[PDB]
Design a protein around this ligand. Structure first.
Ligand code: MG
Ligand code: MG
Lengths: 350, 354
């Protein structure tokens, strides 16, 4: 519940050059609706309705969070791409929320796979069937990265169910699990649609982006999610918490290790890509600011509950905060009623 | 540093061996020879089959040498698993070793990878065709969770080799690249998960320990390998990329500063492996203890790492580290130094021709 969030954020927004996202409320609304619309229609189909066991109210919320995440972060990709990426990252978020045991449905995973038989686990059944709509936007290398990260992610959610923060002294455990379910190579490779980027011409810059972006993305999220994952921790495990349990350190030391990493990550991100192919830098830069924007506005992070508490300050922290925060709401704050409609359950009913 | 930091290398090495508790075992030479031969024999008959001979484009000699080195690594490090399991892991780890010999671009063979997988059509890249066709023989020794770890790691490894075809050590300033690449081609989760056959271990009951072992074994293994390999690669102008060489290029540091990074990490991982597992299930700590010793013994005995050069150079010297090292070395050889003629026969080529 600290206030250190200030120096961490500003240093974070000034390091990446958080000069707001790259859109106009008109354009943001344009993409949000097209994305939501196609995804909303997809999840409302009978087959998707039957195999994806999810509470409507929650699927609706999950879909809206993701479309936001995508449209706001993958700014330079086509409308179709944002939409297909929204369907995929919505499947991942729904899995992250399941409590069903993967074990029994994973017993004949390879043999069914190798044989081309529908997977026993319903989530694999749907995602794999839909996957081509995501992969059509990319070359073979980027596709491999999307496939692996999603397979890793599935193991991550498997492990994340034992709600294990690690054995004390198991120093390699924390980051092991975090990379496992961070979709780092999925996110980092989906930033390069073959339509505007050549996978062979920019192989090296793309590879480097996947390696560096994997940590920036997950770390920044863990950072923005601190004010969230504690005000109502439910036997929760998290990168920050697992550091405590495993490295045997205090919460302040933990959240400090993380913040130091995020800053170094941001620093090297600019140092390495600043002078590379301008189009690459542009996508990278839009993701960072957009990902930040999305975090500041989405309900899921309740970052609103830290506005007025510092909107009456006069320092170099609680002040350079809202100066940025506000910028977020100027384009990031958009009433759902302007794009998220009709609700999924409604299309499903018809 | 045109000269190999012998003293530094010897010191770090002994610190490693002590940290892991390197010592004698109830695993005799006669037992090793039995396993070495059994694993080789099954694998040799496999790679000698025509289909395998056609699709796997590899120089016969190099195939022979790769198999013998992998059989030695498996038999000596997976000491607690069945003879069959040793044979099958042998076939698998040889496939992955051979893939590094390929120079052919995967790009055109991966354009329809997902659609073919989903449809159950044989993969276009011939390596994937063989590896996936033979996978079940490996996977049968394990449960679902450990199997998933074997499958992911091998897929990661394929991407790892693809990336290495570019001989790229990272952009100056790309600090996250080195470890990213090393984990991609390390087979960390493959190794870590293959240590637990469902025949003598229960994933569900030992999930927390197996998972932790994977996370920790991943880094121990790759770093111990980089370390013990530091001597053979020091003067090899052919091997341009490696974890340490990339630390140099990506982090913009000196070879010594980079080498220091590896050793600090290596010893800390060793200290934590012991600290963490000594008080857990006895069987687990045993499989874990055997792998580390086995793995080390292997590095010391396979002529590939040329460590006998460091031995024969300090064999006569009163310094502490030197004597401690040779003691560990001579210790390794007594049970490790086995002539190929006692188990690696007949040659694959011969079985293939017949
Ligand atoms: Mg979860
Ligand atoms: Mg190398």
């Amino acid at each position: 519940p600290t206030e250190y969030f200030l120096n961490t954020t500003v240093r974070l927004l000034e390091y990446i050059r958080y000069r707001d996202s790259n859109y106009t409320r008109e354009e943001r609304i344009e993409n949000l609706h097209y994305a939501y619309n196609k995804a909303a229609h997809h999840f409302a189909q009978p087959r998707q309705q039957q195999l994806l066991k999810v509470d409507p109210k929650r699927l609706q919320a999950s879909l809206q969070t993701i479309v936001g995440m995508v449209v706001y972060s993958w700014a330079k990709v086509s409308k179709e791409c944002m939409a297909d990426l929204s369907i995929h990252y919505t499947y991942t978020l729904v899995l992250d929320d399941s409590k069903d045991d993967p074990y029994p449905t994973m017993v004949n995973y390879f043999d069914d796979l190798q044989a081309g038989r529908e997977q026993a686990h319903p989530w694999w059944a749907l995602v794999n069937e839909h996957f081509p709509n995501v992969l059509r936007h990319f070359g073979p290398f980027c596709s491999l990265n999307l496939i692996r990260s999603t397979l890793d992610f599935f193991e991550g959610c498997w492990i994340e169910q034992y709600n294990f923060g690690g054995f004390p002294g198991s120093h390699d455990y924390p980051q092991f699990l975090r990379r496992m379910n961070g979709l780092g190579h999925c996110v980092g490779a989906s930033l390069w649609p073959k339509e505007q980027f050549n996978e062979r011409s920019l192989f090296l810059e793309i590879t480097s982006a996947i390696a560096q972006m994997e940590n920036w993305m997950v770390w920044v999220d863990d950072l923005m999610s601190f004010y969230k994952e504690f005000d109502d921790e439910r036997d929760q495990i998290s990168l920050v918490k697992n550091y405590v349990v495993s490295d045997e350190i205090s919460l302040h030391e933990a959240l400090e290790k993380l913040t130091q990493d995020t800053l170094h990550s941001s620093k090297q991100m600019v140092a390495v890509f600043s002078d590379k192919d301008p189009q690459v830098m542009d996508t990278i830069e839009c993701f960072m600011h957009g990902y930040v924007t999305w975090h500041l506005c989405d309900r899921r992070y309740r970052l609103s509950e830290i506005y007025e508490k510092v909107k009456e300050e006069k320092t170099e922290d609680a002040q350079k905060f809202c100066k940025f925060y506000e910028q977020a709401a100027n384009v990031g704050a958009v009433s759902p009623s302007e794009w998220a409609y009709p609700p999924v359950a409604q299309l499903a009913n018809v």
